[PDB]
Amino acid sequence: VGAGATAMDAGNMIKPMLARGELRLVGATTLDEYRKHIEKDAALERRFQQVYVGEPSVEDTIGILRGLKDRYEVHHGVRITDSALVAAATLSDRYITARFLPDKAIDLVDEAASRLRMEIDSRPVEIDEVERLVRRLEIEEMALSKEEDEASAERLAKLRSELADQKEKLAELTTRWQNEKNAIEIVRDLKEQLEALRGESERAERDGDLAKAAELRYGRIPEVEKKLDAALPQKEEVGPDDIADVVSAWTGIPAGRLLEGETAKLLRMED
Amino acid sequence: QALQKYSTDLTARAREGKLDPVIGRDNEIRRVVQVLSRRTKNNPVLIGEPGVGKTAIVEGLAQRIVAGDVPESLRDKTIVALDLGSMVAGSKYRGEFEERLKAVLDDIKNSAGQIITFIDELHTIVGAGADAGNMIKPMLARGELRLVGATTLDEYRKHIEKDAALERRFQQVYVGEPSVEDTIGILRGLKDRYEVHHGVRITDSALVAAATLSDRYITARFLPDKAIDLVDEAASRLRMEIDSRPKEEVGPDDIADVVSAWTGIPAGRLLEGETAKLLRMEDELGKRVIGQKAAVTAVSDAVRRSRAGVSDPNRPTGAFMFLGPTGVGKTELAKALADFLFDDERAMVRIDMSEYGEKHTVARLIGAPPGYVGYEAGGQLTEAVRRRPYTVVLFDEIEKAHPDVFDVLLQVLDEGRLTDGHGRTVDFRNTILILTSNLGSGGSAEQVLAAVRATFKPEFINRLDDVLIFEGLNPEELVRIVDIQLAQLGKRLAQRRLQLQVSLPAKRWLAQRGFDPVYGARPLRRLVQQAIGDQLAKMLLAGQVHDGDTVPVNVSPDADSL
Amino acid sequence: QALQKYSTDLTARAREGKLDPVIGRDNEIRRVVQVLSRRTKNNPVLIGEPGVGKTAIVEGLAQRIVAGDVPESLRDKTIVALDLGSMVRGEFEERLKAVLDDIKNSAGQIITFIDELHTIVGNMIKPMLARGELRLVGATTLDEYRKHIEKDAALERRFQQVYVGEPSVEDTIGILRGLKDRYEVHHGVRITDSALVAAATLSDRYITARFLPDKAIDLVDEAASRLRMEIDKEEVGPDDIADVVSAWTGIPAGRLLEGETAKLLRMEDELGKRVIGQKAAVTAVSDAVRRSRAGVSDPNRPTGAFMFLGPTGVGKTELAKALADFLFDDERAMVRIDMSEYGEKHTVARLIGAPPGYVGYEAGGQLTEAVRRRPYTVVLFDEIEKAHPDVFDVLLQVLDEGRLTDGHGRTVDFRNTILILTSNLGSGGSAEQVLAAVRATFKPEFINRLDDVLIFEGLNPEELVRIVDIQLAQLGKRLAQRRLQLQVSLPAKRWLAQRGFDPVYGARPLRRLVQQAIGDQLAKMLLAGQVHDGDTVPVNVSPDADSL
Amino acid sequence: GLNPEELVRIVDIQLAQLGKRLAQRRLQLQVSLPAKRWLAQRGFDPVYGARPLRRLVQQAIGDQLAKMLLAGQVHDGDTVPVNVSPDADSL
Numbered sequence A: 001v002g003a004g005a006t007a008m009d010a011g012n013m014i015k016p017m018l019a020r021g022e023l024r025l026v027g028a029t030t031l032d033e034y035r036k037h038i039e040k041d042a043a044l045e046r047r048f049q050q051v052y053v054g055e056p057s058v059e060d061t062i063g064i065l066r067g068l069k070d071r072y073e074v075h076h077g078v079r080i081t082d083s084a085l086v087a088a089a090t091l092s093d094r095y096i097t098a099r100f101l102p103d104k105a106i107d108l109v110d111e112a113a114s115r116l117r118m119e120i121d122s123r124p125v126e127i128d129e130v131e132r133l134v135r136r137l138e139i140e141e142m143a144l145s146k147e148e149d150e151a152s153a154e155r156l157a158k159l160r161s162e163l164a165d166q167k168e169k170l171a172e173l174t175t176r177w178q179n180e181k182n183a184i185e186i187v188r189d190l191k192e193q194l195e196a197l198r199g200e201s202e203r204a205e206r207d208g209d210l211a212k213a214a215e216l217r218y219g220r221i222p223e224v225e226k227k228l229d230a231a232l233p234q235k236e237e238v239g240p241d242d243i244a245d246v247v248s249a250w251t252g253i254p255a256g257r258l259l260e261g262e263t264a265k266l267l268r269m270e271d
Numbered sequence B: 001q002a003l004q005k006y007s008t009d010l011t012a013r014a015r016e017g018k019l020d021p022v023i024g025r026d027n028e029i030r031r032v033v034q035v036l037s038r039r040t041k042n043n044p045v046l047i048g049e050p051g052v053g054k055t056a057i058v059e060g061l062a063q064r065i066v067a068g069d070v071p072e073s074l075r076d077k078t079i080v081a082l083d084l085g086s087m088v089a090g091s092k093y094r095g096e097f098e099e100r101l102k103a104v105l106d107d108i109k110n111s112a113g114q115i116i117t118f119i120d121e122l123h124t125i126v127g128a129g130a131d132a133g134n135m136i137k138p139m140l141a142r143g144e145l146r147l148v149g150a151t152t153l154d155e156y157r158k159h160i161e162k163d164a165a166l167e168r169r170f171q172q173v174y175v176g177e178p179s180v181e182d183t184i185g186i187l188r189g190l191k192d193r194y195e196v197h198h199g200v201r202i203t204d205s206a207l208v209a210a211a212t213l214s215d216r217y218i219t220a221r222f223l224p225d226k227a228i229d230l231v232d233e234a235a236s237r238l239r240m241e242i243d244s245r246p247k248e249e250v251g252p253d254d255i256a257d258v259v260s261a262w263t264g265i266p267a268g269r270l271l272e273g274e275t276a277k278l279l280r281m282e283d284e285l286g287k288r289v290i291g292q293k294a295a296v297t298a299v300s301d302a303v304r305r306s307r308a309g310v311s312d313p314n315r316p317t318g319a320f321m322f323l324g325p326t327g328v329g330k331t332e333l334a335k336a337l338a339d340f341l342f343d344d345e346r347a348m349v350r351i352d353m354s355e356y357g358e359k360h361t362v363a364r365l366i367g368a369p370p371g372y373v374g375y376e377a378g379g380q381l382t383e384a385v386r387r388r389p390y391t392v393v394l395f396d397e398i399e400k401a402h403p404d405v406f407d408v409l410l411q412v413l414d415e416g417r418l419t420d421g422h423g424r425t426v427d428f429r430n431t432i433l434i435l436t437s438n439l440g441s442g443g444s445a446e447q448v449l450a451a452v453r454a455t456f457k458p459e460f461i462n463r464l465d466d467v468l469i470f471e472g473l474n475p476e477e478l479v480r481i482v483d484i485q486l487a488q489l490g491k492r493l494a495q496r497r498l499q500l501q502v503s504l505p506a507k508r509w510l511a512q513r514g515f516d517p518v519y520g521a522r523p524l525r526r527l528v529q530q531a532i533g534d535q536l537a538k539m540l541l542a543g544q545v546h547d548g549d550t551v552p553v554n555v556s557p558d559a560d561s562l
Numbered sequence C: 001q002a003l004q005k006y007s008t009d010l011t012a013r014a015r016e017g018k019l020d021p022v023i024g025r026d027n028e029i030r031r032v033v034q035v036l037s038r039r040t041k042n043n044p045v046l047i048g049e050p051g052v053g054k055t056a057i058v059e060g061l062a063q064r065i066v067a068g069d070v071p072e073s074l075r076d077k078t079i080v081a082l083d084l085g086s087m088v089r090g091e092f093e094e095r096l097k098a099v100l101d102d103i104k105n106s107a108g109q110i111i112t113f114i115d116e117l118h119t120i121v122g123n124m125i126k127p128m129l130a131r132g133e134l135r136l137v138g139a140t141t142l143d144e145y146r147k148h149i150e151k152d153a154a155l156e157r158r159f160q161q162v163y164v165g166e167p168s169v170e171d172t173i174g175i176l177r178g179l180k181d182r183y184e185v186h187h188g189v190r191i192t193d194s195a196l197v198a199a200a201t202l203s204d205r206y207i208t209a210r211f212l213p214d215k216a217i218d219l220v221d222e223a224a225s226r227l228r229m230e231i232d233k234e235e236v237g238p239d240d241i242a243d244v245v246s247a248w249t250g251i252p253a254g255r256l257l258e259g260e261t262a263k264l265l266r267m268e269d270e271l272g273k274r275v276i277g278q279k280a281a282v283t284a285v286s287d288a289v290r291r292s293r294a295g296v297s298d299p300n301r302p303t304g305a306f307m308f309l310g311p312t313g314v315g316k317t318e319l320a321k322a323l324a325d326f327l328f329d330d331e332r333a334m335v336r337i338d339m340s341e342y343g344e345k346h347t348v349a350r351l352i353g354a355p356p357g358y359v360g361y362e363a364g365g366q367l368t369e370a371v372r373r374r375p376y377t378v379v380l381f382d383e384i385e386k387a388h389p390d391v392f393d394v395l396l397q398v399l400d401e402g403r404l405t406d407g408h409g410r411t412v413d414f415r416n417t418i419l420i421l422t423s424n425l426g427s428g429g430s431a432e433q434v435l436a437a438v439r440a441t442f443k444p445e446f447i448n449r450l451d452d453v454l455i456f457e458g459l460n461p462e463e464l465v466r467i468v469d470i471q472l473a474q475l476g477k478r479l480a481q482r483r484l485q486l487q488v489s490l491p492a493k494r495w496l497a498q499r500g501f502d503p504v505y506g507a508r509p510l511r512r513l514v515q516q517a518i519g520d521q522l523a524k525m526l527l528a529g530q531v532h533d534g535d536t537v538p539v540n541v542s543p544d545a546d547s548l
Numbered sequence D: 001g002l003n004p005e006e007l008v009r010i011v012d013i014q015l016a017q018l019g020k021r022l023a024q025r026r027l028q029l030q031v032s033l034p035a036k037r038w039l040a041q042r043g044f045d046p047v048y049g050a051r052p053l054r055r056l057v058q059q060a061i062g063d064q065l066a067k068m069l070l071a072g073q074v075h076d077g078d079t080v081p082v083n084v085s086p087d088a089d090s091l
């Protein structure tokens, strides 16, 4: 509208060419400004046809995501599960009641993938924060100790307790992480072994070794597969709960899955 | 040479060590990073009430980048402090700000995605128009520039949320204020900077006392800087006391000295002299109120508890309601109290409940709702108490206002809360509410303690403290009452040099006439006036009296004479 | 030093002494140098009325600098002023950029100084300021600062206020007597402490527009210059300044003297110059006002609470109009509020206006909003007998404690006002039943706190000639545009009495009755001829009416 | 409403609050079961709920504690034990 002014002279030089259809001029503008700037100038608005674009539903947002679930999966070196897509397309409509559907859904998936890639970095979350906190309490107890005062006696006696009882949890989280990191050698090593068993069944059938054919098909190979299954799990691709963690960190409504840290608190709420 | 005269380098500034050592807030830095590392629409905006450290997070991110503690795709990005005050400033022509903005954008997008940008107070981005701060909107929603921002709640809502199609390209990071423990941590972290600036020393007890007082007495600003300002103020005052004046470190009571030097609250640890005055209270208050030994002890004990350190910090400093016969000294006791702990009789806030016999007249002490005549003016009582948060509220003769005004005090008491028109909140936590009455009128203590019950409600009588009953005027002590009145009169006779020689029989006849059993000592000041002041006025402008003469009085058989 | 053409220095010219020493106000300097020595929220701002010494304090600090007494942190740091009326649409921001860049590349702590910066603040100095390289010391007034630095600022978090209200009489006297020799060589006449103190007190009391430290110097220098020009008396004195104050305000040098004895002794016919007869009432009221300001009555009471009633048209109001004229120097001061609409129970809230948010709130009450401004009025109360017996409670509260409460929440003060409760009771009784009716109708104890309750004595059938005579002396001024004089004749003048009294509204019509007659009966002669500006215009009493 | 058996725990809670508020001046109390049950025995008049108990705690402990505290002899640190008497309770 106001291309160059000083008294209207510019911005309507294309008003003559529009009518004869010389130029085609496809354009897209928001809805609460088409009646704030253009509609005020109904001499020019007349040359425009409107194509109302309604917001899609969850069923179509799921499809949009399923199609777009490659660019992010590539830009970040991670993988994405379809459960994440569905859970995002549902929670983004249930909770974030301020924006519209095709976008507030994609944002959750994108942030989840970004966080996951940031965790394949040196250390995962919930341990880096504890070690930073331990270093803080250390640098604090070191400089509060040299207090030629008396009011610092009972104030420092608890800081030692807190430092020790957070360092304990640091060491425990460290040990559990080392366990879970050393667990992905066997489960997979067996396969490194299970693949060897598949080569063995190949060669059993090469040599006419029927006796080994089934011993590998119904014995060794499936037995190794069953060994991996052993106990059903109670971190290389996003899941339908990192979405919940993002929707909890933003619009601080808590919507996780009660990750065993507080279910005792809920069952204790009365007392 | 485009973003060289419209921008500095915050990263190089942090490399030169000239920034402050942020302490804590790892959650928000991690959130800002995992937002700034997205694929499209990567622009976080730090939101939160003003003063809580919305820039400190950005300096923290800069320091972390310089130190090298960030993920793989965030190293060596050199965040830039952009500014628009020096782009829209000098331009008087058509299309001149556009060339500068386009030069800046072009210089950004020529280099690779390693010029992460930072506009502070970006509520100054919607103007510049006359089609400005709007051409910059295609680049935003494609991940070309990063544009870390920082804006207050109010300015955000007022300036951006009116432009929805632009607010979409942003992400909010609610930076809530920290608690007392985190504040103590931050203060202990920053201690050394001030300890070096001012050549003094600062004690950890002083830091703790600052972080605790700045939360209980200044309830209009926010913590992470509301606390630091006190430490700075006290360090500066100690420096000035050291210099220019021919046991050199701040203490945990200098902070109380500051936080009492403004806001008027006497918060402290009972420095000397003050304790002598408090111990010497019942008698020091007796020189203005004779009798009522039961009441003075109660108010004195209230003040004693409140200032000694044993009293619920969230409830008023007392909510007494004393009532009794007419003309006994209730309002006068309240005024004498206010004169005791202020030495300013006109520094209390008395409201006359005798006016509020009408229902709707309550609006004077509350305000009016949004959309009505007097809205931006506020409420009388709330305005008077929002400043001077140490007064002595009074409710003269609260028996007239029909039983609806009793439903505002009902929650003024027991919490010290009140909400005016604008939706604000005020604190009555360190005032002394006092509300007289005249129930009874002759009846015994068990005939007036029925009037109280049948007039008010249980939910009300349960709120306020002891219901003091006032005795009747003893027929003897009126001599001392007349003594007080003559002392006040002599004090009025000080511009001249007159004195009085009041005789004992004159004083006796005075205390004898004008104390009728139904109205107490009320018809005494007017009698003193009409029997001394006017008689002297007719006797001074017409000679025969001059300043210096120790005027005596007589007990002539008729009305009193000189 | 590249663009130092919109900036003046304070330490350079201090190295010569072209400034004035600022003895006094040594607290403010310490406060300022303390604020400027912090780490955050430095660079204070001086807040006070105009011509109070804002520039005086900063110059005193500059001189203490050039001498050297402050902490060595602030030592060896100069100051530079700025004038904004030289910068000012556009290019003001360009020159702002130039000067700010100059300060920035100066690479030091060269303090600035920006007078009345409420025209500057905007967003161009905050990125410069929240970095710690420049130090600006500004100044403005209180309400103005409350305007430009509170609504559109968001910057008040980096500005520290400093208050300088006003010096007192004793202080500006010291200021004057310090700043005396400079003029004794500029003109050079002589100076007297009597003249100095007279200037101070008289300016403070009567020049109620400007303020003290510059107001006193203005008058002193003006009188000195006038007495140097007069040689076209080698000293200045109290009269030598009272003459100037009289020439300035309009009030002559006479009344500008002792205001107790020579005033309370003027309660004589100076009233009777406007009122006629009723000398008893004038004497009673004069005694009441004399004894009231003695200095022994209680400090919370109206300056007078008397009432007068009886026959109308005798000049009941005229007494009050002359009374306010003599005391408060104006007859457009009394405020008449009729007690007629106040015959209903609810309408008593009209003269206050109770709630915020109801019909009458912004207009305020009839009584208070006309008293809280001009707290020197003389309130009148017509037909006090018809007012409902609830306003009398308000009146009680007035004349039992000199304060009242409006609806806005304010407190109005009544300790130096005068109440007057007119009426019309006593139509049949002379002095016997009028007092009984006044006792019975009103509450007989409310009357006790009143002063004398005098009744105006009727007009003598002879003593209408005096009122009509003042009337004629007045109307003689009417046709001063053509200098046509007028005639007098006892038959004609007394002819007005028996035909203009009409004893139900005194001499209400006695102005119009005669003015329309004489004026519009001669107005045709004044266009045809028959008169010129020496003619007595002899008007006579024709057989029936007043022709010429 | 409340039962006299339920006010004992309320007394415990009020005393915990008062001790936590006193820990700012590094004091604490040692209350004997005589006084602990005496206070609840003064939780009378089952019409005003449980606020009378709070005003009682104030009137019976806080005034005397302040009176001692600002008159020396109770210098910061050492704890004071409260012990019941025939009618009131002394420190």
Ligand SMILES: Nc1ncnc2c1ncn2[C@@H]1O[C@H](COP(=O)(O)OP(=O)(O)OP(O)(O)=S)[C@@H](O)[C@H]1O
Pocket (backbone or CB within 6 Å): B020, B021, B022, B023, B024, B025, B050, B051, B052, B053, B054, B055, B056, B150, B151, B152, B186, B190, B224, B225, B228, C040, C157
């Ligand atoms: N976590 C923190 N670590 C160190 N200093 C902090 C921290 N939080 C706040 N501060 C200090 O507290 C003050 C806060 O100032 P800023 O955060 O710069 O103001 P702001 O947060 O931008 O608020 P506005 O909107 O600009 S008024 C500064 O002195 C900071 O150094």
Ligand SMILES: Nc1ncnc2c1ncn2[C@@H]1O[C@H](COP(=O)(O)OP(=O)(O)OP(O)(O)=S)[C@@H](O)[C@H]1O
Pocket (backbone or CB within 6 Å): B288, B289, B290, B291, B292, B325, B326, B327, B328, B329, B330, B331, B332, B333, B397, B437, B438, B481, B484, B520, B521, B522, B525
């Ligand atoms: N013990 C006392 N000491 C000093 N003055 C007293 C005492 N008892 C009464 N008076 C005087 O009695 C007069 C009335 O006191 P007020 O307190 O103002 O009346 P009041 O208590 O408000 O009674 P009501 O119900 O409001 S009329 C004042 O002049 C007091 O000085």
Ligand SMILES: Nc1ncnc2c1ncn2[C@@H]1O[C@H](COP(=O)(O)OP(=O)(O)OP(O)(O)=S)[C@@H](O)[C@H]1O
Pocket (backbone or CB within 6 Å): C020, C021, C022, C023, C024, C025, C049, C050, C051, C052, C053, C054, C055, C056, C057, C175, C213, C214
């Ligand atoms: N304590 C003082 N010592 C010496 N001179 C003073 C003192 N106070 C005031 N003055 C003189 O009174 C004059 C006051 O004028 P200004 O300094 O312009 O006033 P201001 O404080 O700047 O406020 P404005 O702008 O005039 S309303 C100065 O010229 C001083 O010479």
Ligand SMILES: Nc1ncnc2c1ncn2[C@@H]1O[C@H](COP(=O)(O)OP(=O)(O)O)[C@@H](O)[C@H]1O
Pocket (backbone or CB within 6 Å): C274, C275, C276, C277, C312, C313, C314, C315, C316, C317, C318, C467, C505, C506, C507, C508, C511
């Ligand atoms: N005593 C008087 N002295 C001078 N003028 C008087 C006197 N009595 C009456 N008047 C004249 O009467 C006019 C109107 O009388 P006024 O007092 O206004 O009426 P009312 O007394 O009924 O209120 C005055 O303007 C004045 O001209």
